[PDB]
Amino acid sequence: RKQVSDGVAHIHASFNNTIVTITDRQGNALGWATAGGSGFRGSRKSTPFAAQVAAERCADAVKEYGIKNLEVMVKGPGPGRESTIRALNAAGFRITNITDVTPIPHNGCRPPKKRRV
Amino acid sequence: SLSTEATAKIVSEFGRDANDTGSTEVQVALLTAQINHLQGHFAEHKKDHHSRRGLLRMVSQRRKLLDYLKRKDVARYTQLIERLGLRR
Amino acid sequence: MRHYEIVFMVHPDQSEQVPGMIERYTAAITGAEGKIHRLEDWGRRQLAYPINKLHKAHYVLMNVEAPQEVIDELETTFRFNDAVIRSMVMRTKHAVTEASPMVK
Amino acid sequence: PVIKVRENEPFDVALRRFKRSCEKAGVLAEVRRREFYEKPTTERKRAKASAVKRHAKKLARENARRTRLY
Amino acid sequence: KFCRFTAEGVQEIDYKDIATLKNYITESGKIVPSRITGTRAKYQRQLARAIKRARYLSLLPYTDRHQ
RNA sequence: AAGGAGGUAUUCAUGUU
RNA sequence: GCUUGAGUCUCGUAGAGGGGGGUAGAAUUCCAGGUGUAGCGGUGAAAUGCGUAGAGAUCUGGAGGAAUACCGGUGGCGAAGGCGGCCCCCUGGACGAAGACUGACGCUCAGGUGCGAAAGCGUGGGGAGCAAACAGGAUUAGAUACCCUGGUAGUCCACGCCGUAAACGAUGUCGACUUGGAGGUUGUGCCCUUGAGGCGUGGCUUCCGGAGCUAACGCGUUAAGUCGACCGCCUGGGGAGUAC
Ligand SMILES: [Mg+2]
Ligand SMILES: [Mg+2]
Ligand SMILES: [Mg+2]
Ligand SMILES: [Mg+2]
Ligand SMILES: [Mg+2]
Ligand SMILES: [Mg+2]
Ligand SMILES: [Mg+2]
Ligand SMILES: [Mg+2]
Ligand SMILES: [Mg+2]
Ligand SMILES: [Mg+2]
Ligand SMILES: [Mg+2]
Ligand SMILES: [Mg+2]
Ligand SMILES: [Mg+2]
Ligand SMILES: [Mg+2]
Ligand SMILES: [Mg+2]
Ligand SMILES: [Mg+2]
């Protein structure tokens, strides 16, 4: 309701699922959307198209706030990782910053064991 | 290892001629001083096996030099072990 | 005597005390007959990343020839002094009595 | 890989620039290699094999570049 | 090629020289490989030590997602 | 992922960007 | 007696060599709070599991443990095992230059002594992540597995014990001699450094290859070539590195 005209789009794109969250510049979240909510399940929810429709759904959700400017923070090794950005541009926000925020450790915790499939 | 001034003092003390560094007595004296110095370090650091290996090499080299000196000149051997306080 | 090179960054709020701290450390080293080859107050410098949520520390560089006991005492003083945000002392082979690149 | 849209810069150009920056950084490769724990033996073996492969083909090219193809 | 340090006969990197370190780091903050830069191995090791010391003293950022 | 070029890969003024 | 082997001294060089103590940032986990709402998580596909007591996501603060991205390299160091953020303290070895010195003080080595990855054991701590055993969900004709969700010993620290690995270059140590080429790394001498260069001279190291050797594969100045000194080991396959 409190119009701010500038948001931050956090795109957490894992291999399985993509979560897009629009928030204020300070950190308070406004709206979110996911491929699971978009209806795709499993092999279809791990596709760029699902990420695009989730981004569109999130943009519609936060439409009430009337945000115009939008800085993008993309995180995680996700299948789409880009379709969300294209969807936001299509939805009609001025993309200000495109930033990668993937958390890379400096040889920290040990990862899980390799899968034998 | 061992400081320069300490090495110079030992060479002066034990050298037959002040510039005769190669003397067996000088070498044994240098080895003995270094061995005695490292005792405190190895008391402090019991797990320093890599350095202790070098210490063992020094000890073995000293006894070999002492054996050679005993073969060549007995009186010099007796005098040197008296000076350095080495058991046999 | 071993040549050391000390850099200790001070909280910008306590910048007015920096000459006093410089004088104290210099007096300690001189009393211990340690030489002081360089002493350059760089000032506030806008640190690349926020150390303890603070920016713009007072860098202050000092190249010294002093014994290791006094260096250890100075390091303890640095650790216990809340004013100094960070410090580093590094051994050097030769006393580099030249101008620093950023001062130059 | 921070990217800020330049003045009078098209969005498609900016997006391609961002992908180029990510490629240069090598983010996807790093996270993918860090997905699972590789044993030190496996890592050393893989690195050595790659070096051997690279060196072998270098020699092969530099030698077989002096022959009659036809 | 063209190892810059050996051209001037530099003895040590002198980590306080930020501008040279800025040339030898990437935008993301990591160290550019010697294979790309052209630096000699000895100067590369000295450069790596200097950059790490500068990072600790906060003259250079560890990464661009720090501050 | 697919196709083209160069190399064992860079020198290729900084600036600009 | 001698100085060529061996060793000592003078000056420097490079190294993740070792021990101890601090410190840095990223990241994971947990805790507290704000925003915010119905999914999250996972797979080939699912379920177990987590979430309306508000998860996941996002921001702020805090605690804790472990490990050091980039640099990083058929690069370096160590007798081998092995060693990787940065700083300080203690400490071992190697190499180069010029000389000076001692004068065979050497090589090898049964017993003996020491060091010796990982797993394991004892005592006491610590415990983030990972993970034998175990629990559950799947897959399958069966699945005491591979896959998924959890998860204890252990992995970490201190002090002891164990003493085994494809502990491998499947190549014992020392020394001498025998055509070459392309590199890497670390010294150092000279030539106008004609500016990043030119010509030497060492140490270590990777690849290709000649004679020669080899059953062949291949090795090839770092030999598996031609020789010398000492040591260890083999005598068909199983039984068996087992029984006593
Ligand atoms: Mg998994
Ligand atoms: Mg010595
Ligand atoms: Mg070696
Ligand atoms: Mg034996
Ligand atoms: Mg163990
Ligand atoms: Mg235990
Ligand atoms: Mg216990
Ligand atoms: Mg499991
Ligand atoms: Mg687990
Ligand atoms: Mg055995
Ligand atoms: Mg091994
Ligand atoms: Mg064997
Ligand atoms: Mg032997
Ligand atoms: Mg060959
Ligand atoms: Mg038995
Ligand atoms: Mg057995």
Is residue C11 a contact partner of residue C47, using CB atoms and an 8 Å limit?
no
- Residue-wise over E19-43: b if at least 16 C-beta within 10 A, else e? ebbeebbeebbebeebeebebbeeb
Q: Is nucleic acid strand G under 7 Å from E16's C-beta?
A: no
CA dist E54 and C47 (Å) reads: 11
CA dist B62 and C64 (Å) reads: 40
CA dist C8 and C58 (Å) reads: 8
Task: Name which of C50, C88, C101 is nearest E57 (Cβ-Cβ).
Answer: C88
State the CB neighbour count (10 A cutoff) for residue B81: 16
In sequence order, what are the beta bridge partners of A12?
A19, A75
Backbone angles phi, psi at C39, to 5 degrees: -155, 105
Phi-psi category of residue C51: left, alpha or beta, with phi > 0 → left and psi -120 to 50 → alpha? beta
Residue A113 CA, ligand 9 centroid: distance in Å: 9
Tokens of A104: 């890379």
Residues 6+ apart with CB under 8 A from A78: A11, A12, A13, A14, A15, A18, A51
Is residue E48 a contact partner of residue E31, using CB atoms and an 8 Å limit?
yes
CA atoms within 13 A on the CB side of A36: 7
Strand order across the C61-66 sheet: C35-40, C61-66, C2-10, C84-92
Count residue pairs from D and E with Cβ separation < 8 A: 7
Nucleotide lying nearest to D61, CA to C1' measure:
F8
CA dist C50 and E2 (Å) reads: 37
Backbone angles phi, psi at A7, to 5 degrees: -130, 170
DSSP states of D22-46: HHHHTHHHHHHHTSS---HHHHHHH
Tokens of A88: 């936001």
**Residues, CB < 7 Å to strand F:** D 6, 58, 61; E 1-2, 35-36, 38
Is residue C49 a contact partner of residue C9, using CB atoms and an 8 Å limit?
no
CA dist C93 and C3 (Å) reads: 6
Long-range contacts, stretch A59-63, CB < 8 angstroms, 24+ apart: A59/A22, A59/A87, A59/A88, A59/A91, A59/A93, A61/A22, A61/A31, A61/A32, A61/A33, A62/A7, A62/A22, A62/A30, A62/A31
DSSP states of E8-53: HT-S---TT-HHHHHHTB-TTSPBPPHHHH---HHHHHHHHHHHHH
Closest Cα of chain D to A77: distance in Å? Answer: 6
CB spacing of E64 vs D25 below 8 angstroms: no
User: How far apart, in Å, are the Cα atoms of A3 and each of A6, A25, E19?
Assistant: 9, 12, 44
Residue D38 CA, ligand 7 centroid: distance in Å: 28
Q: Is nucleic acid strand G under 7 Å from A115's C-beta?
A: yes
Is residue A95 a contact partner of residue A67, using CB atoms and an 8 Å limit?
no
Domain ranges of chain B: 1-88
The SS3 assignment for A82 reads: coil
Chains touching D, CB cut-off 8 Å, 3+ pairs: A, E
In sequence order, what are the beta bridge partners of B53?
none
Is residue A21 a contact partner of residue A57, using CB atoms and an 8 Å limit?
no
Nucleotide lying nearest to D55, CA to C1' measure:
G207
For residue A86, the one-letter residue type is R
State the CB neighbour count (10 A cutoff) for residue C36: 16
CA dist A61 and A51 (Å) reads: 15
State the CB neighbour count (10 A cutoff) for residue B54: 13
* D65 CA → G223 C1’, Å: 31
Is the minimum CB–CB distance between D68 and chain A shorter than 8 Å?
no
| H or E element at residue E67 | none
Provide Rg for chain A, Cα atoms: 15
State the CB neighbour count (10 A cutoff) for residue C94: 9
Experimental method: cryo-EM
Sign of CA dihedral D55, D56, D57, D58: positive
CA dist E44 and B44 (Å) reads: 37
Is residue E13 a contact partner of residue E46, using CB atoms and an 8 Å limit?
yes
Q: Which of E37, E11, E43 is nearest to E23 (CA)?
A: E37
| H or E element at residue A7 | strand A6-13
CA dist E55 and C28 (Å) reads: 29
Is residue E58 a contact partner of residue C9, using CB atoms and an 8 Å limit?
yes
Per DSSP bridges, beta strands A94-100 and A69-75 are parallel
| H or E element at residue A77 | none
DSSP states of chain C: -EEEEEEEEE-GGGGGGHHHHHHHHHHHHHHTT-EEEEEE---B---SS-BTTB---B--EEEEEE-HHHHHHHHHHHHH-SSEEEEEEEEESS---S--TTT-
Backbone angles phi, psi at B12, to 5 degrees: -60, -45
Residues 6+ apart with CB under 8 A from C83: C10, C11, C14, C17, C21
CA dist A9 and A15 (Å) reads: 19
Count residue pairs from A and D with Cβ separation < 8 A: 54
The residue to which tokens 């000890």 are assigned: B59
Nucleotide lying nearest to D9, CA to C1' measure:
F17
CA dist B35 and B19 (Å) reads: 23
Query: Resolution of the deposited coordinates, in angstroms?
Result: 2.5
∠ CA E4-E7-E13, nearest 5°, is 55
CA dist A111 and C49 (Å) reads: 28
